[PDB]
Write a protein that binds this DNA or RNA. Structure first.
Lengths: 119, 98, 226, 297
RNA sequence: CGCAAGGCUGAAAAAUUGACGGAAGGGCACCACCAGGGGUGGAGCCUGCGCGCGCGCUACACUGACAGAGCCAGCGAGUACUCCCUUGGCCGAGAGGCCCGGGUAAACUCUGUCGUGCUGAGGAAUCCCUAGUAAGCGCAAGUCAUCAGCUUGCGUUGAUUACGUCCCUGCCCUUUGUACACACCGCCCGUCGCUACUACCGAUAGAGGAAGUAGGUCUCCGUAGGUGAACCUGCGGAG
RNA sequence: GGCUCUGUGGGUGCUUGGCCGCUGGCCAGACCUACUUCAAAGCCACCGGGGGUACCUACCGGUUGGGGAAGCCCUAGCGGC
């Protein structure tokens, strides 16, 4: 902000900062620097954490149950199992968080949907 | 997403590759390795129009040929090839009547 | 891309997920991609027709390797199984279910038994021998397996480290190291340091892949390449 | 992959709604910047908003960049505008006729980078699935009445808009003999658009000119020998496809090489071909009182 | 309200960057070759386009007819849907309502009965087509444009033959650029324009016509001066 | 006879003693309080962002009144600069 408004490096680093924060999912728009004024927030980081983002994705029911499930280790993010309940899930890894391989929670979901393939 | 690619230039010298190697009692290369001068002959000397002589031209082959010894037909053909690259990129009554 | 040109030749496509392992055939005719759409692709690029034959698998593909005499390929999935396919007639000719053979675990910060830890039961990387007769397979686990590609048996298993300062090197941790505040190799003991640069914790919360802070107390055992 | 398409479409719709609210605020912020430079007195409701001034000090620069045109608007085409060659497949309805298949071939040859696909027994969600699985930019569906085509459906992918239009006055390439016609040249065509002035007209101009690969801008004003013309009167966009030689610096000889349409659009939906429940952006309002008087585009 | 709003007039250039090619070498293409498949075109019906033309639809027999047995889908639910019009009679003061007459598949599989019998699969051309593709089959819907003379979905059964090459027909592009190592290549060719200069030709210093070229440190001593013991500078000698 | 729950011991890393004022002693302890020449070298030392600064504190530069380490000189003193 304190740079002059027609500055090239100001414009380039505004677009870089907004694109970085929108790719990490903290901001919901990438067209205002007042988003980084009063919308970037430790609560925005803490809701980009893993048990809250799988509460939102409805992998669990509540953030307490989600922290219990990812402490017991049913949740992988991508291809690697995640035991840390503070792993910050970015906007393009929210498409890859899912259950682990031999999960009893996955067997519970398939047994509910009556698609329990035992092979 | 990493970063936009911004141009960065690196100045290499004419020292051998055992000056880029790490510090150790002896080199890992043999005796043949260690004379490779880290810049190619194209960077030691490349014949071009900016480093040619005054009377001469250099061709696309890297050979000095002079404008005086060049014939008219080859001058016309070199002009045509350079032009092809450029294309790729009240009076008096007596004065009226007589 | 092309090496002698420098610019981008193509973006091949047909994968419904991120592509995890690539392998060009050692004669030079076939690219094979393997991706988390539970699929692999025999890409033929260098012919006049550019074609893609899919190999449908059971889980996410983790590794792809060729035989040196290029008629065979081994692809290692996320179930923990290796499948040996043929590249000429794209049929699976062989297979190893290798979860038990690589499952050696129980890190600190792991509330499962080492037999129930999923995640250290797969082969992240596989390489044929230079003979072409034995795979070697290693994942995020203590064991390296050395399989035979014809007789399909495990010839020899190795242990990478005896080092107990690493985290996942014994599958049965002892109950002497479990206090009433968690394990004894888990309490933050930075505050009992004489030097300030050792006492300062410049670590980021939830950073699995590297941070310059890097507490790195009791790192895991994983074979990331063979 | 499918979770990524759904997530990116939802993020796009949320960003568009936030852009609506931010435009409602930024119409007020552009009065404060113009009054600061010119000194004309402004409204008290604008000059006495502390949040507006406090955030204006950070958000000057994007308004200046939009005034200079240095940035581009959040759009489904602005992500890959002149970077990728848009690949596009043309398909028929389910059981095509021979003249519909030859017409599908003709409007495939209209685009230099298009491909044609045989429908046969191909369910339409799996058609959309295969398009997103092979990263196609556009699909175009054709509908015939009885050997004469009556509808196009131009759908942009991954989640872009459909334009459904009905065709009239179709004169096929496959009616004239091979002695008079010939193999159409496949060079990158120039495009001209005539009569689009509303923002809806610029919308249909965008979703029609992002079907063609981008022209090399070094010497495009004189090179290239093939033009495609979209000109609308009474909101029925009429399209010709010519090939030309410049027989002098003052004159040009045209030669009609492709099919002639006068397509009329009747539906522009912000959502792909599978979504029948996508939110429409415009539709041809027949059976209203002044829907025949009012001209859109 | 003021300007715009006064007719040497009477319809059908730029260029040191430009105009057009040729030869060689690449890339691609069911508008190309190659191997096959399928339409249309023969008879009848009809939308449409301008009597003609195609696009659909139907009939045309070994892939047969009759009678049985068994066994398979998917999309589809707005108190909403109905094929006519009539001979009679009922109850109808009258308008109507009644009654009785007349005009969740196809396919497939198995088992038997009969046996080619106006009971004949489309010429020249021309077009299209390479995997759940060609082709057969039914079921459903009718979505502000188009479509009942049909349209669009949806399932079912599911092949032959290419998947190579630029030889033919073409299309695009290289011969300038856009990156550097290895490695390889090695001044593509023609007809004119334009510009600069040079001289020529001939009518009245001049507009045209025609052409060509582009090497004494340290220490000491003897001196002479300086600000004097000393100390400094300069010189001449020895170590 | 069975399930469940609980307790103790061993194991879950390669085997060199219990304690102390530890080259020696003690496990029944013993003796109790001495001995002393000359305080100290400096630096660093993690509070989220923008902003206010009356008062307190930190740093820098000064002002009055006292204080005199040390440096310099000599008429030698209770000295002088």
């Amino acid at each position: 902000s304190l740079l002059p408004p027609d500055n090239e490096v100001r414009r380039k680093h505004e677009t870089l900062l907004l694109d970085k924060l929108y790719d990490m999912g903290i901001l919901s728009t990438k067209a205002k620097l007042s988003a980084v004024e009063h919308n970037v927030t430790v609560s925005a980081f803490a809701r980009r954490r893993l048990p809250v983002v799988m509460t939102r994705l409805r992998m669990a029911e509540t953030v307490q149950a989600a922290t219990k499930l990812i402490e017991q280790g049913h949740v992988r993010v991508g291809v690697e199992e995640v035991r840390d309940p503070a792993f910050l899930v970015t906007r393009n890894m929210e498409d890859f968080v899912t259950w682990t391989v031999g999960s009893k929670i996955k067997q519970n979901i398939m047994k509910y949907r009556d698609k329990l393939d035992d092979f | 997403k990493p970063k936009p690619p911004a141009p960065t230039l690196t100045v290499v010298s004419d020292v051998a590759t055992v000056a880029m190697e790490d510090a150790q009692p002896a080199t890992a290369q043999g005796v043949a390795g260690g004379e490779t001068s880290m810049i190619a002959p194209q960077e030691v000397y490349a014949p071009s129009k900016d480093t040619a002589e005054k009377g001469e031209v250099v061709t696309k082959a890297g050979i000095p040929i002079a404008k005086q010894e060049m014939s008219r037909e080859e001058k016309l053909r070199r002009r045509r090839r350079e032009k092809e690259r450029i294309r790729k990129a009240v009076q008096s009554s007596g004065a009226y009547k007589l | 891309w092309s090496v002698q040109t420098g610019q981008l030749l193509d973006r091949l496509s047909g994968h419904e997920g991120p592509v995890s392992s690539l392998a060009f055939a050692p004669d030079g005719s076939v690219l094979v991609s393997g991706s988390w759409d539970r699929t692999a692709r025999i890409w033929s690029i260098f012919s006049r027709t550019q074609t893609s034959e899919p190999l449908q698998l059971q889980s996410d593909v983790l590794d792809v390797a060729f035989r040196p005499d290029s008629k065979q390929i081994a692809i290692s999935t996320l179930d923990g199984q290796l499948t040996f396919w043929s590249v000429s007639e794209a049929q699976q000719v062989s297979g190893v279910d290798g979860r038990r053979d690589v499952s050696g675990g129980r890190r600190i910060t792991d509330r499962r038994t080492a037999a129930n830890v999923a995640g250290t039961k797969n082969f992240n990387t596989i390489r044929y021998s230079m003979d072409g007769t034995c795979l070697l397979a290693g994942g995020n686990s203590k064991y390296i397996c050395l399989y035979s590609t014809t007789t399909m048996v495990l010839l020899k298993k190795f242990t990478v480290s005896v080092n107990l300062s690493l985290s996942g090197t014994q599958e049965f941790l002892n109950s002497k190291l479990m206090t009433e505040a968690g394990p004894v190799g888990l309490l933050d003991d930075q505050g009992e340091a004489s030097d300030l640069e050792d006492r300062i914790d410049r670590s980021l919360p939830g950073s699995k892949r590297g941070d310059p802070g890097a507490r790195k107390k009791f790192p895991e055992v994983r074979v990331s390449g063979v | 992959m499918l979770r990524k398409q759904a997530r990116q479409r939802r993020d796009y719709l949320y960003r568009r709604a936030l852009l609506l609210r931010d435009a409602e605020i930024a119409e007020k912020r552009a009065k404060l910047r113009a009054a600061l430079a010119s000194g004309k007195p402004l409204d008290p409701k604008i000059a006495n908003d502390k949040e507006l001034r406090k955030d204006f000090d950070y958000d000057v620069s994007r308004d200046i960049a939009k005034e200079q045109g240095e940035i581009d608007i959040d759009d489904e085409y602005s992500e890959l505008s002149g970077i990728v060659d848009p690949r596009v497949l043309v398909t028929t309805s389910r059981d095509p006729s021979s003249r519909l298949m030859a017409f599908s071939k003709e409007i495939r040859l209209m685009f230099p980078t298009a491909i044609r696909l045989n429908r046969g027994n191909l369910i339409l969600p799996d058609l959309v699935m295969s398009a997103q699985r092979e990263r196609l930019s556009d699909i175009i569906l054709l509908h015939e009445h009885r050997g004469t085509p009556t509808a196009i459906t131009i759908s942009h992918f991954p989640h872009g808009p459909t334009l459904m239009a009905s065709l009239h006055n179709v004169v096929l390439r496959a009616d004239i003999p091979k002695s008079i016609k010939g193999t159409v040249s496949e060079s990158y065509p120039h495009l001209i658009f005539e009569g689009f002035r509303t923002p809806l007209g610029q919308r249909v101009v965008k979703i029609l000119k992002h079907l063609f690969p981008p022209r090399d801008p070094t010497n495009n004003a004189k090179s290239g020998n093939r033009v495609i013309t979209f000109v609308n009167q009474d909101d029925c966009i009429e399209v010709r496809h010519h090939v030309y030689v410049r027989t002098n610096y003052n004159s040009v000889e045209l030669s009609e090489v492709g099919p002639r349409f006068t397509m009329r659009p009747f539906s522009i939906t912000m959502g792909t071909l599978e979504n029948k429940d996508a939110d429409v952006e415009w539709h041809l309002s027949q059976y209203t009182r002044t829907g025949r008087k009012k001209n859109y585009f």
